[PDB]
Design a binder for this molecule. Structure first.
Ligand SMILES: CCCCCCCCOCCOCCOCCOCCO
Ligand SMILES: CCCCCCCCOCCOCCOCCOCCO
Ligand SMILES: CCCCCCCCOCCOCCOCCOCCO
Ligand SMILES: CCCCCCCCOCCOCCOCCOCCO
Ligand SMILES: CCCCCCCCOCCOCCOCCOCCO
Ligand SMILES: CCCCCCCCCCCC[N+](C)(C)[O-]
Ligand SMILES: CCCCCCCCCCCC[N+](C)(C)[O-]
Ligand SMILES: CCCCCCCCCCCC[N+](C)(C)[O-]
Ligand SMILES: CCCCCCCCCCCC[N+](C)(C)[O-]
Ligand SMILES: CCCCCCCCCCCC[N+](C)(C)[O-]
Ligand SMILES: CCCCCCCCCCCC[N+](C)(C)[O-]
Ligand SMILES: CCCCCCCCCCCC[N+](C)(C)[O-]
Ligand code: NA
Ligand code: NA
Ligand code: NA
Lengths: 296, 278, 276
């Protein structure tokens, strides 16, 4: 099996079957863009360890490290004039996000009739800086966060399914997953500087799926085209002594079109560049990533 | 031969020569965001008859399911209802040779069978219902061209939609008023260009772009002169990535992604079509 | 080397090393969308002298036609130049088994287009600009290498804008304010992959991103102040082809999808490089 084919399957399935222990370093850049303008430059360094057992089971742990920069622009401004200034920027120095781990089980091996199929579960912990309690600090009509979050503040569990099959030369693949967020509590759920309100949060659950095609171009390179869509239900807050109330407009549909490659730098090292184009306003405008899975 | 080649030509030309009588079941999902979020599904039912690889006759019945959500949130929906029924005649006037392209000329007649937008009232403010068609007759002559330059298959198409003037009992969306009036929906010009590839015996892949340009629409209330609706013009651009997959010798699966490039296009459109050859 | 391969390299590198002289005619349409819709056409005229597949000298004259509609009133610019520019390029690495084709270049752009500063709001602009009003110098790097059948390529450049002055920096019809302007510098890069499909055709997929720093103004008798929201990130996804019409004439269609709000929705272009 050519390296390109192996690397392709790893990328499409999330199941790294060539080896035994592997470590992937990833760098990702993502770009986002009372009436005010927010521009965000977000970098994520991903550190992922994987153990593949007999091409059947896989265990992984991922530690994301988040660097962020948001710029807030008002047109308040200076003072009361609907089209004047105003620029405030806020940043987060490199900090851990939400640590997570996954178990995957390959329940179908590809044959003439069957796909490679992998079932998986992913458990994510709330280790990142949560968004709840972050205060908006007041130019007169421009309020800006005192800090930026690096995670969503809750535990979550994500069972998933991946399928891959070669119809030479096209490799078709698809995937689907469901994220259940666990309810949790916080000392402060208010972003009012003047107040402190304890409360609980239920983050809306989400459904994710993707399909795509990939090609092995030569011994060392593959290319991939895919689409994906994430659908998130609205989120709810319960202040102490209050009831559950939904946050209007917290629901989301984040669609992406992805073009990527796999490049075998050696037997052990792959370079995986990818572009994800945001198709909806809930997605970043675009996302560039470069991943370096290394096999040992 | 190969199936992939046939299926791709069908896709690129709109002329299905597989091929005598065929029935195509299509499912389409389209996503819009204005605050209004729209999830729109269309089940397409299309019958086609290809006569001697020269003439093609078809009827299409679209069935529309819609959910719009309005955020202060209130939601409005349309249960599965028929849209604008239409039929088409196509004539292949050039057959592909070393020098010639496959070229098809066509006309499509669309009837106002869907629930029209004109009576629909804004109720304290969301619509009481969602339309399923545009409320007018339209006629669309079109042109398609396809040619293989091995292994690239280049294609392009162009069409013009003339909308017929029509009259309605109510043109107003004010709940308190009823105003009869006439409507001229702005005509539109559509074109696209692309490239496709046969990957193997059974599969093709396609990349294309298209753009629709619609002129302004006009209203005449009873008594009453013609007024342009100054913001009714549109430019809807799309980038398409698609496949054809020969499931058997009778069934093709056609997945397509259309990415909206402009604000008048849905954010994205996913479709899955299943042409079946009897 | 097949014509497709040559045309491919020319497109990816900007270095047209298969002839002494070339002239490229390009037509570009771009679409942008109180509401404003803009239809913008640019006719590009570019002459190149390639010396021994080692050096290249070029001049580009863009001719700009523009139409903006404000919602309804419309404003237009009849065909007018163009920030004229020229470039010098040097191929410092020739592709071998180990090395890429690599070209270093410098591009000098002059402020010949109608500048935006001083254009009055009358509410709609009285006119539309065709250039940015300043000199700029852009050193750049291009790299291309075949890993059969994939041709990988990439490019990167930095634009330094020269400070300049204008008689009027205000768009207020009632005022005239002289001032100096430092246009924010920019960093540009792209990467992509291309394929020779046959003797005569190639296809390309690429991405690019332009990052522009904020600009600053000094009105006369005032101090330097940064122009909020003048910073920009214009990202593009490109799908393109090269088609050999003759051994001299290539047709180059390209679609550039804007990925950010600082980019046009989309850009369709058609370029016709001609080797003499
Ligand atoms: C970039 C979007 C391109 C679409 C990706 C294709 C995968 C999604 O398709 C869903 C249905 O496909 C099932 C394929 O079934 C195989 C049939 O072939 C059997 C005969 O050889
Ligand atoms: C407008 C319908 C015309 C179709 C009639 C075609 C007759 C062809 O005869 C086949 C030999
Ligand atoms: C199902 C649509 C029918 C189209 C109009 C009539 C076509 C008649 O063709 C007859 C051909 O027979 C020739 C022998
Ligand atoms: C996303 C795609 C971007 C670039 C696609 C450009 C496609 C250029 O194709 C033009 C289409 O024209 C179709 C006609 O083909 C037949 C040519 O007829 C000439 C006879 O030799
Ligand atoms: C067919 C047109 C050739 C035009 C050559 C343009 C020369 C560019 O000028 C700058 C180079 O100066 C150093 C020589
Ligand atoms: C952030 C680095 C994570 C390293 C985690 C490695 C997962 C495999 C653990 C051993 C399984 C027995
Ligand atoms: C750029 C981030 C995209 C997020 C949307 C997710 C799309 C596909 C979801 C299924 C993933 C399942 N998998 C491969 C983990 O098993
Ligand atoms: C993983 C490859 C990353 C590609 C490089 C993208 C650079 C984006 C830089 C944005 C931040 C710079 N700036 C000027 C806004 O400060
Ligand atoms: C995806 C929505 C497309 C809307 C605009 C389409 C422009 C195509 C013009 C003529 C169509 C002929 N064709 C390709 C169907 O054979
Ligand atoms: C040549 C055959 C053309 C297709 C004919 C299909 C009839 C449509 C019946 C579907 C009914 C839909 N609905 C939901 C309103 O009940
Ligand atoms: C309104 C018409 C709807 C479509 C007509 C479908 C007819 C079903 C025929 C089933 C038998 C087909 N076959 C090839 C398996 O024999
Ligand atoms: C046409 C839009 C401009 C966007 C800026 C980014 C362009 C990156 C590609 C530069 C190509 C340079 N060169 C010398 C290789 O041709
Ligand atoms: Na959107
Ligand atoms: Na737009
Ligand atoms: Na944007």
């Amino acid at each position: 099996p050519a390296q390109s084919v192996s690397n392709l399957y790893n990328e499409a399935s999330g199941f790294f079957g060539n080896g035994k222990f592997s470590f992937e370093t990833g760098i990702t850049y993502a770009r986002y863009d009372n009436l005010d303008r927010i521009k965000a430059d977000n970098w994520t360094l991903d550190l992922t360890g994987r153990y593949n057992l007999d091409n059947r089971w896989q265990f992984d742990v991922n530690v994301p490290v988040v660097y962020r920069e948001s710029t807030y622009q008002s047109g308040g401004a200076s003072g009361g004039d609907p089209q004047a200034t105003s620029e405030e920027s806020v940043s987060r120095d490199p900090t851990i996000g939400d640590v997570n781990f996954g178990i995957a089980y390959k329940f179908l091996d590809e044959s003439a009739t069957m796909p490679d199929a992998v079932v998986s579960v992913r458990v994510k912990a709330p280790t990142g800086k949560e968004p709840f309690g972050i205060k908006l600090v007041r130019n007169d009509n421009l309020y800006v966060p005192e800090s930026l979050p690096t995670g969503n503040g809750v535990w979550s569990i994500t069972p998933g399914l991946s399928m891959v099959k070669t119809f030479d030369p096209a490799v078709l693949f698809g995937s689907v997953s469901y994220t259940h967020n666990l309810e949790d509590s916080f000392d402060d759920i208010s972003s009012d500087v003047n107040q402190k309100v304890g409360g609980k949060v239920r983050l809306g659950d989400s459904f994710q799926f993707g399909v795509g095609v990939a090609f092995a171009l030569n011994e060392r390179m593959s290319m991939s085209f895919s689409v994906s869509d994430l659908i998130q239900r609205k989120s709810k807050l319960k202040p102490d002594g209050g009831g559950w109330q939904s946050i209007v407009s917290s629901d989301a549909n984040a669609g992406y079109f992805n073009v990527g490659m796999t490049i075998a730098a050696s037997e052990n090292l792959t370079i995986v560049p990818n572009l994800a184009i945001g198709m909806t306003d809930d997605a970043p405008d675009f996302t560039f990533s470069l991943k370096f899975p290394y096999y040992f």
